[PDB]
C-alpha cells in the first residue's frame, strides 16, 4: 500500500517466532524501540498491529519516536511512548519500473500534523490561500498526492524501500500472541532441574500410572506439593520424585 494509505493488519491468536526476522540478513534497518532486538520470544502481548508502506531511502529514518519529517508529520506519525520494532529493506528490484512508477503516492500538503497512528486518505483539493478551490486545481490549489516516480537507475536515497512497522500493545486482557521458547528433548530417570508451563522445580522425572483428566496439566499430593505433571508436547504423565537427599 501507499504511504498515505498504509494498510493495518491485526495479528492475534497465534504463536510468533521473532528470531527468524533478526537472523535473516535481508533487512537493511533493524532497530527496536523500548525493547531489545533479542529476547523477543519471551514476551506476550494482547494484540499486534502490522503496518506496511513504501517510501524512499532518505525517509527511512523519519519513522522514529521523537523525530520529525514530511512522512512523520503528514503521512505516518509514531507516538513518543511507542514500543516495538521497525523493519525496512531495499525494494528496488520490485517497486521500480523503466520510465518511472507512479503507483505509489505520498501526501505532501496538509494544514496540521497528523496525530500518532492516524490514516488520512482524503483527496480534497488543498486550499493554499483565502480563495476556495471548489474542486478545481490551479493557483493556490494543489493536489495533495504526488507521484514518487521510482526508477531502477535511481540513487540509494531515491530507491524505494518496503517498510514494515510492528506495534506492541498490552492490556489486562489475556495475551493472545506469545513466543515459543526452545524445548530441549525430555530426559528420564535423572535428577534434573525442570521447568514446565506453570511451575519450576528439581526432581526425577519417571513414568507414572496416574490417569489425568484430558484438561488437567498438574498433579498435587496431600500436603499441597506437586507429585505429577503432564508434558506440554507429549500426552504423557510424569511423576516428580524428589532427588536423593539426607543428613550426613
Amino acid at each position: 500500500a501507499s504511504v498515505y494509505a498504509w494498510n493495518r493488519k491485526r495479528i492475534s491468536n497465534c504463536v510468533a517466532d521473532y528470531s527468524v526476522l533478526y537472523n535473516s540478513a535481508s533487512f537493511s534497518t533493524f532497530k527496536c524501540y523500548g525493547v531489545s532486538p533479542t529476547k523477543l520470544n519471551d514476551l506476550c502481548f494482547t494484540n499486534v498491529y502490522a503496518d506496511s508502506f513504501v517510501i524512499r531511502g532518505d525517509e527511512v529514518r523519519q519513522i522514529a519516536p521523537g523525530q520529525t519529517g514530511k512522512i512523520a508529520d503528514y503521512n505516518y506519525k509514531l507516538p513518543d511512548d511507542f514500543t516495538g520494532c521497525v523493519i525496512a529493506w531495499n525494494s528496488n528490484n520490485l517497486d521500480s519500473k523503466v520510465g518511472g512508477n507512479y503507483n505509489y503516492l505520498y501526501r505532501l500538503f496538509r494544514k496540521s500534523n497528523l496525530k500518532p497512528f492516524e490514516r488520512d486518505i482524503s483527496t480534497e483539493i488543498y486550499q493554499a490561500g483565502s480563495t476556495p478551490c471548489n474542486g478545481v486545481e490551479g493557483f493556490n490549489c494543489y493536489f495533495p498526492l504526488q507521484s514518487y516516480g521510482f526508477q531502477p537507475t535511481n540513487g540509494v536515497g531515491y530507491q524505494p524501500y518496503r517498510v514494515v512497522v510492528l506495534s506492541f500493545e498490552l492490556l489486562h486482557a489475556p495475551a493472545t500472541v506469545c513466543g515459543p521458547k526452545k524445548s530441549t528433548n525430555l530426559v528420564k530417570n535423572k535428577c534434573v532441574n525442570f521447568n514446565f508451563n506453570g511451575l519450576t522445580g528439581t526432581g526425577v522425572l519417571t513414568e507414572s500410572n496416574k490417569k489425568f483428566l484430558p484438561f488437567q496439566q498438574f498433579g498435587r499430593d496431600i500436603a499441597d506439593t506437586t507429585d505429577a505433571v503432564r508434558d506440554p508436547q507429549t500426552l504423557e504423565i510424569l511423576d516428580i520424585t524428589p532427588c536423593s537427599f539426607g543428613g550426613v
Partner: antibody
Amino acid sequence: EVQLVESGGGLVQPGGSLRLSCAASGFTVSSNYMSWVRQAPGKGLEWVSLIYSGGSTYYADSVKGRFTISRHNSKNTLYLQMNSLRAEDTAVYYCARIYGDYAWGQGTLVTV
Amino acid sequence: DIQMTQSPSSLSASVGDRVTITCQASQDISNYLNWYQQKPGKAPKLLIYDASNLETGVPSRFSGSRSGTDFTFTISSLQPEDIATYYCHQYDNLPLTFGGGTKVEIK
C-alpha cells in the same frame, strides 16, 4: 494582489543579532511551505532554511545553532532571527514559496 | 550533501540562436528539478517546474528535457531580454542545492 515585501536589513557588527520580516498578501503563509534563501555577491545562490506548514523547522549545515525562523499569526509576517553573524553571512536574503509556484520578495541587504 | 555542478559556466549567442545547456547530478534524481532565470538586479524566476511542466505565464520557448541522470534546458529563440543567470535546483533532498549559475550573453 500577491506580493512579498521584505524589511529589516542593515549593517550589523560581527557577533550581533538581527531580525528580518517578510509580509505576504493574497495567500496564507501558514498553509504553505516558506523558506529563506540568501545570495552572497560574487557567487551563486544558497539555500538556508525552510519551515513546514505544521511548524517543523530545519536549517542548513552552516547555520546550526545560529539561525531561527518563526511566524506571527495575526499580521501574517514571516521572520528570520539570526544570532552571532559571521563575515561569510553577508548576503542578500529573500523569502520564497517552496512548491506549486515560486514567489520572491524584493530582497534586502544584510552586511556584516 | 548532494554534489551538483552546472555546465557550461558562460556562453554567448546571437538573437534567435539555438542555446543548449546541461545540468549534471552525481546522484540520480527522477524528475525533481526546476529551472530559474536571475535577471541582473532582480530575483530568479521559475520557468519549468518538475522538469517537464510549464509554469503559468512563462512563454513556450522555454522547455526542460530529461536526459537520464542529467537534465538539459532548451531555448528555441534567444532574445536580448533573456539575459539572465541559469540555475538548476534539485528538490526533495535536504539540503536543497542551487547551482553555481550559467551566464548567457548577447553577442
